Swiss-Prot record, chain B:
This is V(D)J recombination-activating protein 1. The chain holds residues 474 to 568 of 1040 of the full protein. The gene is Rag1. Belongs to the RAG1 family. Homodimer. Component of the RAG complex composed of core components RAG1 and RAG2, and associated component HMGB1 or HMGB2. Interacts with DCAF1, leading to recruitment of the CUL4A-RBX1-DDB1-DCAF1/VPRBP complex to ubiquitinate proteins and limit error-prone repair during V(D)J recombination. The lineage of its organism: Eukaryota, Metazoa, Chordata, Craniata, Vertebrata. It is found in: Nucleus. Maturing lymphoid cells and central nervous system. Disruption phenotype: Mice display a severe combined immunodeficiency phenotype. The have a small lymphoid organs that do not contain mature B and T-lymphocytes. The arrest of B- and T-cell differentiation occurs at an early stage and correlates with the inability to perform V(D)J recombination. The frequency of homologous immunoglobulin pairing is much lower. No obvious neuroanatomical or behavioral abnormalities have been observed.
From Swiss-Prot, chain C:
GO terms for cellular component: nucleoplasm; nucleus. Belongs to the RAG2 family. The lineage of its organism: Eukaryota, Metazoa, Chordata, Craniata, Vertebrata. Maturing lymphoid cells. This is V(D)J recombination-activating protein 2. Keywords: Chromatin regulator, DNA recombination, Metal-binding, Nucleus, Zinc, Zinc-finger. Component of the RAG complex composed of core components RAG1 and RAG2, and associated component HMGB1 or HMGB2. The atypical PHD-type zinc finger recognizes and binds histone H3 trimethylated on 'Lys-4' (H3K4me3). It comes from the Eukaryota. Its main location: nucleus. One of its GO terms (molecular function) is histone H3K4me3 reader activity. Core component of the RAG complex, a multiprotein complex that mediates the DNA cleavage phase during V(D)J recombination. V(D)J recombination assembles a diverse repertoire of immunoglobulin and T-cell receptor genes in developing B and T-lymphocytes through rearrangement of different V (variable), in some cases D (diversity), and J (joining) gene segments. It is found in: Nucleus. Disruption phenotype: Mice are viable but fail to produce mature B or T-lymphocytes. Very immature lymphoid cells are present in primary lymphoid organs. These cells do not rearrange their immunoglobulin or T-cell receptor loci. Double knockout with TREX1 does not show a visible phenotype.
Amino acid sequence: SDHETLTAILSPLIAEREAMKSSELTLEMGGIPRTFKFIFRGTGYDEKLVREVEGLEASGSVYICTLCDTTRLEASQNLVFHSITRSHAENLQRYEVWRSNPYHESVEELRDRVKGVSAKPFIETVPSIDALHCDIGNAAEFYKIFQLEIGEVYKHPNASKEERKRWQATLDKHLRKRMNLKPIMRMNG
Amino acid sequence: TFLSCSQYHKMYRTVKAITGRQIFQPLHALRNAEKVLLPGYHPFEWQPPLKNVSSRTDVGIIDGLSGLASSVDEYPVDTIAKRFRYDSALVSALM
Amino acid sequence: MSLQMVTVGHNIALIQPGFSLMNFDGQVFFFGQKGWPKRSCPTGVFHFDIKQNHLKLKPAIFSKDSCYLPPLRYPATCSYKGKHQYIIHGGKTPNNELSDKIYIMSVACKNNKKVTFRCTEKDLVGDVPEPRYGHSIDVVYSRGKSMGVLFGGRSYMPSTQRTTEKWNSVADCLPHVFLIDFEFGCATSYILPELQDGLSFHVSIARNDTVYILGGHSLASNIRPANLYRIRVDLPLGTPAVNCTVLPGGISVSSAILTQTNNDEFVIVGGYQLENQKRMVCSLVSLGDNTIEISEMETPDWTSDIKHSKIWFGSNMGNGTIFLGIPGDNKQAMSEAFYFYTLRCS
Ligand SMILES: [Zn+2]
């Protein structure tokens, strides 16, 4: 997250990549020479590195999906009817609108105009979902929902900052008594 | 096997002196066989040549800072970093 | 020359070497934070108010017609006091890339001490200067008219001789001199033969028709030329004119911090004499009508941590008051990554 040093190091590599994206490599391979063409796909970036390099605001924002520009609230009234619309060219364009502000808007209107893009996209990634952290996050989410079902919250809300800890104790004792599933403080796959 | 050079040499000379044969190969025959597997060994050529990219073909482990300005006057930097040149490393990965 | 340590709030991290401290009507504003504008403050421009030796980096919104500018790390900033406003040229965007844009900080609304800036931008034509940093721009007056002089500092290799094995290597620009009309935003480059070698991180001084350049690293040969240069700028009714003169009494220094203690009487606080010579002696530039009177004061009392460190940074809060920083302690790793100081030139 040392953005300056990170860009200092990775700028030449991105330069070379953009260069060799548009030529052909002649390489003698076992006798005859072959001509290779390349197609790069930056996809193995976790959610935080995607929001950083591509020039998005941190993960706690109102704009959640790094693939479609929808807000956390309206992502609850409507769960599955979206479509991928967060490219890299469009995000360079949105940063340009932000920095330029040609319509003379306020901060909280310009944000809406440019969908939480307030940084120049540094690397070209592709819209994807990171299956590893996707599954780990879903699992931690279900751990929490198990605790909240133990607390019977669906009838009486707003417990304390220690009733829920007691609920966690109930859950982890029951789990490392019915599965020998030792409790962990760091969720792992 | 994560052996080191002194340990590999121990094993080499011991197997050699016991068996009499030379089952393992000496260290320099491993450095030579290693030069063939890193990047910066094969001749390749791009077309059209790569803009802003060198044309040499023996470019190995470059310093990662890429000639970053490191004095007491520029933005301070002490992050040691090494890298390959992208094109030569990609060529090595293909061959 | 009373040095004083300073305490710092919760967003200490937002300070980095190469920042800027602008000054509007007696109040100071931090600019050029570390990393793209976080959501707490979308502009990076802060109230840099120090009270009881405790500073509160507070946010500050822009106007409804401004231009949100990226936090630059080594700009050239002059106080164009002609409506009071500041000029921003060049710098290293958080993505490590140089900007050619010029910005104009003004204050379009201030009520209940809530300042509303206005960061309009103006582009250049004609002999536009190469994107660069470490340089120094300054405004000059003549015949009522005014102009902006720009004597360049280092930059990146041009777009042809630039290779990825040396993608970040820098080179001093050509020692031209640029004149900039802010009205039309028109640039004009001038070759000056008495200036030969490039010069970055120097210290410029504007006195109402002249510019005293002094100090400054020279990357072309890695030396700090101790010769200072008076530029005289004349504004006829047609085309302007420039002249340069070497002068004696200069100082070999770079990355020095300037401020104006009295009228036409400046102080220059630590820079560097060598690649490892932490500068200590301060220098009084007692201006005059046409002559520069260099001198020195009693080397303001430096603590132990300032002597046992290697680098620093800072700027001038505006009223004979310099703000310095210093890196933390790596062997005393329970350090907050930076220690700070304000010292009053009084
Ligand atoms: Zn989505």
